[PDB]
Design a protein around this nucleic acid. Structure first.
Lengths: 129, 212, 156, 225, 259
RNA sequence: GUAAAGCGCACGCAGGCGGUUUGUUAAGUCAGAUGUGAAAUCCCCGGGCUCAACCUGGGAACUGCAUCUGAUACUGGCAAG
RNA sequence: CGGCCCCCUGGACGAAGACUGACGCUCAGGUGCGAAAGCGUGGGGAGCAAACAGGAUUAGAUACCCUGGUAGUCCACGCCGUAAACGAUGUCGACUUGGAGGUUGUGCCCUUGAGGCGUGGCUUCCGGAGCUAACGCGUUAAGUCGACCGCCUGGGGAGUAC
């Protein structure tokens, strides 16, 4: 059964990048939306678009720089089987700071740097590079 | 042997036998490295030509692409930073610093001729400051010419030539929409001021009629 | 200017009607002490000829690597067939902490400071290939900025 | 330069069947007519123009062009095209490693040249018959194989090809060496190795001729420049 | 723009599948291959034997136009099924024209009954007939001057199997294959059938409304085993064959050619 | 899959995991504080034995536990969809 | 699991709608089904055939071959619980280029004809990216991921002893 929506998102994105798909669509969720927004802010994607009322569909638009994809790597870290929660000091650095780590915090979902700046940790969703 | 089996693209060989012999070479991007093959293990083959016909300062430059990269490569072995261009006689104006000019110029009558035939035309070694000096000696002149072009009032002309790049000398062929962004652009009049400059050119041709 | 290291040389056999024909394989690697690196794997009936071939091949099929000053830009993994390799940027003075073929390639590459372990197989050929792969994929800050449409200070 | 109507007349828009296509060509396909793929001329034309411009630029800097077609339908035409602009060509079977293994083939060229000289300039006749027949046969072989590229000297600076899938060996060689590739690529073909792809009917004779003629004209222009 | 889309549907509108629109201009002749271009993906490898008329020499130079046939695409490279079949549609149209006025008038010269019925030939092709049709009455053209010239007056046609029998004389006078498969049966009814594919043990001549015949390898000639059918007859040609044997059950009508 | 390693196949309790929206809670989670976490040991900056080991001042650390005050994105609970 | 028929009976798929409203996935223990051989009791017994007997072959022939031939194979009700019980590939879900078929639905289309254009289910082969020690797998993954379980830790001794 479908158990982890976010991870499914990330896999879809990965597969689109692999296959040189322009855009990747999937059912929408708020957490998914926020993640997409974070990615866009962090520039791994061009734009995201949710559409629909009863069952809305998130549609991300993937990014390709000099042929190859932008999202070099994208992994979940927290997962239903095994959750990961980090305190602000302990927060990670993806690719020695070049990549990002999406982290959900009390004040919303943000990149690891942003969280560090804020002064708070939380659940580590995914690394992106 | 790579050059012999068409692996080291060797165009011209602008070199002065009996002194310095610097020459650039191109190659089909395939992990070949042209200069490297010409040099060898610690200048293995380089030493051969060094003591071949006589003590010569042979040099190899990694040709990049087109003639623009040939300019810098012709200034080697030294440190080029920038260069000017033109039409038929572009005259590569070498732009380096006094400190690095000592080696770049090397000898008054040696590296100034060896690097002159490098591109096939001729080079004009200059200085970083020299470039700027001549650079400004050009902004004032599309203006530094008794202003024989458009002409209207002078108080507006100063404020227009402040923002104006390359004065107005034949600037109508450029973007005719960025001067309308200037604070003060009602009906097409500045787009008309440039037309006046065009008329001034015709007036200059009429002056040629006055002299021919 | 280029420096060249023969990593290994190995005798390999071919059985024929008469008996065993022996030959020699030479694994070399070359580099300019900067980003640029290339390995070559030559074969000949005699050893010196085989290493000569290895050098020739290495000199061609060279690859560039984006080095932050003496070390790497971030931890990087690279694999090839059995040899799976981890290598990690390190502070000036630490030197090349790496084993075997891997070491050699790093030195010619002109990296001076790394912490580096070869998991899995340590078959010199495969492990050097894996190293090269890890070095190639490694991107720089400017590169990622360009990829992503940002400035370097935005990425830090 | 080359108009769309002319291409349509030639039969460029036609492309291979629907069981023989390549999904990397899906962009370049427009539709499928009578279970036959149609190439999108709207997307073909601009790129063809581009490719022409690049070829012209190459010519301007005194670039060496190699014209490859071994389809044996358009071998005559490719040779004609090469000659019109006095460039080089391989209208018969491409020798495996012609470019990569140039140095060996260069000897081959030299032997061919020597044989030609013997035939023509020497005027020595008086050769043992069988031996003379053998030398003649060798000459014919070498002319067929390396006739166009004999005056080439080194390695070309660009590579025009009539079929990518058919000449994939040449393409691969060009890629290994880094020579620019200008390929006519039908729906069945693989354009990944190609630098300046050209979606067009490699098979049809008139279309091939048209492709060649425009290429030759732009080479001549660049030479004039 | 939609220029191209409109053109695509235009060019759809101005071609059809079968060999109907005489469009292919002969753009290269050499012996033994003619080639055309009917606005198809490729040029047809035409035989010379589709295009020589009734005495053995060619008739069309460069630029000449005949339609070919379609609905089969790309055996690996190329385009068509041959154009004489197109001529068969014109012959069918001429035969149908009879219906209008109840009399199709041509020349028809029927010397001898292949399979009971005199063979009647229209200009290039020769068709086979059922017995009654050669003669309106018991007149029997065996006493007429050999290969005589009258006309063809249609007595019988099979309407799915191209067997058409016509009346040469007497100007004044004016599932489906397998249930009733007893028409060409009795022992020896000969037929005019085009061969389709020679499978190295066979030839597969099969013409008579969706059946299959095999003249396989043993008869074919008057040599048994060293024969290799491709050498000895043809590809795609109408020949002498007769039944010799029928299965109505395991649908193997085993024709012969040594007759 | 072939190197050791997918139960012969199913159903299914306990257990593990759980679509989507809103509200609420605040258990998990995070932040801050307080209490404690003996001294010695380890590490940092110092000092004293001629140096060192050794001795030694101050810090840091002791990743934890308990409480109180917040945060509520996520996980959980409860209520409605 | 294979001749037809009838009776009782489980599942699958498609077509539209209508409803319920997360009721789901996985599963240690547990429970059930589980080829062939084998066991028990009672029936049956044509053919075949472990065992057995004879004839050959052979150095020997406790085999292969031949002639016979009993358990068994068949039925009923119990037990046994294992097989290279194999796709040597756990189950469920999602995503990622293609081609050629088979089978079984179903929508439209002049079925003008065996057809034309789609859209579902199951299924055979080839092959791309990717993966793989390679062989190969390749939208039915051995690719990219998530949930749960089972299992492995050098060869023998040993899947044996207690």
């Amino acid at each position: 059964s479908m158990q982890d929506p976010i991870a499914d998102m990330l896999t879809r994105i990965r597969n689109g990048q692999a296959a040189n798909k322009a855009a990747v669509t999937m059912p929408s969720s708020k957490l998914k939306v926020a993640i997409a927004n974070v990615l866009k802010e962090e520039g791994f994607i061009e734009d995201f678009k949710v559409e629909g009322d009863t069952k809305p569909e998130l549609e991300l638009t993937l990014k390709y720089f000099q042929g190859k994809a932008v999202v070099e790597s994208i992994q979940r870290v927290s997962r239903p089987g095994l959750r990961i929660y980090k305190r602000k000091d302990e927060l990670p650095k993806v690719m020695a700071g070049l990549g990002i780590a999406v982290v959900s915090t009390s004040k919303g979902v943000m990149t690891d740097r942003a969280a560090r700046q804020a002064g708070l940790g939380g659940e580590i969703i995914c690394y992106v590079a | 042997p790579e050059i012999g089996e068409e692996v080291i693209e060797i165009k011209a060989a602008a070199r002065d036998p009996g002194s310095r012999a610097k020459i650039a070479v191109k190659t089909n991007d395939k992990r070949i490295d042209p200069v490297g093959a010409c040099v060898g293990m610690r200048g293995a083959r380089v030493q051969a030509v060094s003591t071949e016909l006589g003590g010569e300062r042979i040099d190899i430059v990694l040709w990049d692409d087109n003639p623009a990269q040939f300019v810098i490569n012709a200034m080697a072995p030294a440190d080029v930073a920038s260069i000017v261009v033109d039409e038929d006689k572009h005259t590569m104006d070498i732009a380096v610093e006094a400190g690095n000019l000592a080696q770049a110029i090397g000898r008054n009558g040696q590296n100034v001729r060896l690097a002159s035939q490098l591109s096939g035309w001729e080079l004009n070694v200059m200085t970083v400051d020299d470039l700027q000096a001549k650079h400004q000696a050009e902004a004032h002149a599309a203006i530094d010419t008794f202003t024989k072009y458009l002409d209207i009032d002078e108080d507006f002309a100063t404020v227009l030539v402040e923002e104006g790049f390359s004065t107005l000398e034949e600037l109508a062929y450029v973007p005719m929409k960025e001067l309308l962004e200037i604070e003060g652009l009602d009906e097409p009049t500045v787009e008309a001021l440039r037309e006046r400059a065009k008329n001034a050119l015709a007036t200059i041709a009429q002056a040629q009629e006055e002299s021919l | 200017e280029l420096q060249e290291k023969l990593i290994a040389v190995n005798r390999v056999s071919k059985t024929v009607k008469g008996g065993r024909i022996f030959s020699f394989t030479a694994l070399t690697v070359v580099g300019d002490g900067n980003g640029r690196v290339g390995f070559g794997y030559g074969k000949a009936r005699e050893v010196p000829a085989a290493i000569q071939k290895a050098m020739e091949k290495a000199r061609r099929n060279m690859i560039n690597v984006a080095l932050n000053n003496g070390t790497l830009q971030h931890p990087v993994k690279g694999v090839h067939t059995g040899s799976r390799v981890f290598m990690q940027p390190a502070s000036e003075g630490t030197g090349i902490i790496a084993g075997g073929a891997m070491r050699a390639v790093l030195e010619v590459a002109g990296v001076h400071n790394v912490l580096a372990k070869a998991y899995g197989s340590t078959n010199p050929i495969n492990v050097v290939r894996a190293t090269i792969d890890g070095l190639e994929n490694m991107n720089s800050p400017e590169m990622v900025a360009a990829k992503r449409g940002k400035s370097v200070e935005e990425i830090l | 330069t080359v108009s769309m109507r002319d291409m349509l007349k030639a039969g460029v828009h036609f492309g291979h069947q629907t069981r023989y296509w390549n999904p990397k060509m899906k962009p370049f396909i427009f539709g499928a007519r009578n279970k036959v793929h149609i190439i999108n001329l709207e997307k073909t034309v601009p790129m063809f123009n581009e490719a022409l411009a690049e070829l012209n630029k190459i010519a301007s800097r005194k670039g060496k062009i190699l014209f490859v077609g071994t389809k044996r339908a358009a071998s005559e035409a490719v040779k004609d095209a090469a000659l019109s602009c006095d460039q080089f060509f391989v209208n018969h079977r491409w020798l495996g490693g012609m470019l990569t293994n140039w140095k060996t083939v260069r000897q081959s060229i030299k032997r061919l040249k020597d044989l030609e000289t013997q035939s023509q300039d020497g005027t020595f006749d008086k050769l043992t018959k069988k031996e003379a027949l053998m030398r003649t046969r060798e000459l014919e072989k070498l002319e067929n194989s390396l006739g166009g590229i004999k005056d080439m000297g080194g390695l070309p600076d660009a590579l025009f090809v009539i079929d990518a899938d058919h000449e994939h060996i040449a393409i691969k060689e060009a890629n290994n060496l880094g020579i620019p590739v200008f390929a006519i690529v039908d729906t069945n073909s693989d354009p990944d190795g190609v630098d300046f792809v050209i979606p067009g009917n490699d098979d049809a004779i008139r279309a091939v001729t048209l492709y060649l003629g425009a290429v030759a004209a732009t080479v001549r222009e660049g030479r004039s420049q | 723009e939609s220029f191209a889309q409109l053109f695509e549907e235009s060019l759809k509108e101005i071609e059809t599948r079968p060999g109907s629109i005489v469009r292919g201009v002969v753009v290269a002749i050499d012996k033994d291959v003619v080639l055309v271009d009917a606005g198809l993906k490729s040029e047809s490898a035409i035989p010379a034997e589709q295009f020589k008329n009734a005495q053995g020499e060619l008739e069309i130079q460069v630029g000449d136009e005949v339609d070919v046939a379609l609905d089969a695409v790309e055996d690996g490279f190329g385009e068509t099924l041959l154009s004489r079949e197109k001529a068969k549609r014109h012959e069918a149209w001429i035969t149908l024209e009879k219906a209008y006025e109840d009399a199709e008038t041509v020349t028809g010269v029927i010397n001898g009954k292949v399979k009971g019925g005199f063979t009647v030939e229209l200009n290039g092709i020769r068709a086979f007939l059922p017995g009654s049709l050669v003669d309106v009455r018991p007149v029997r053209d065996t006493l007429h001057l050999e290969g005589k010239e009258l006309e063809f007056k249609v007595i019988k046609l099979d309407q799915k199997r191209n067997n058409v029998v016509v009346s040469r004389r007497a100007v004044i006078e004016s599932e489906d294959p397998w249930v009733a498969i007893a028409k060409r049966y009795p022992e020896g009814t000969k037929l005019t059938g085009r061969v389709t594919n020679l499978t190295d043990y066979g030839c597969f001549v099969e013409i008579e409304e969706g059946v299959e015949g095999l003249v396989h390898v043993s008869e074919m000639d008057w040599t048994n085993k060293n024969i290799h059918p491709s050498k000895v007859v043809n590809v795609g040609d109408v020949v002498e064959v007769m039944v010799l044997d029928i299965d109505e059950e395991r649908r193997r009508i085993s024709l012969g050619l040594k007759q």
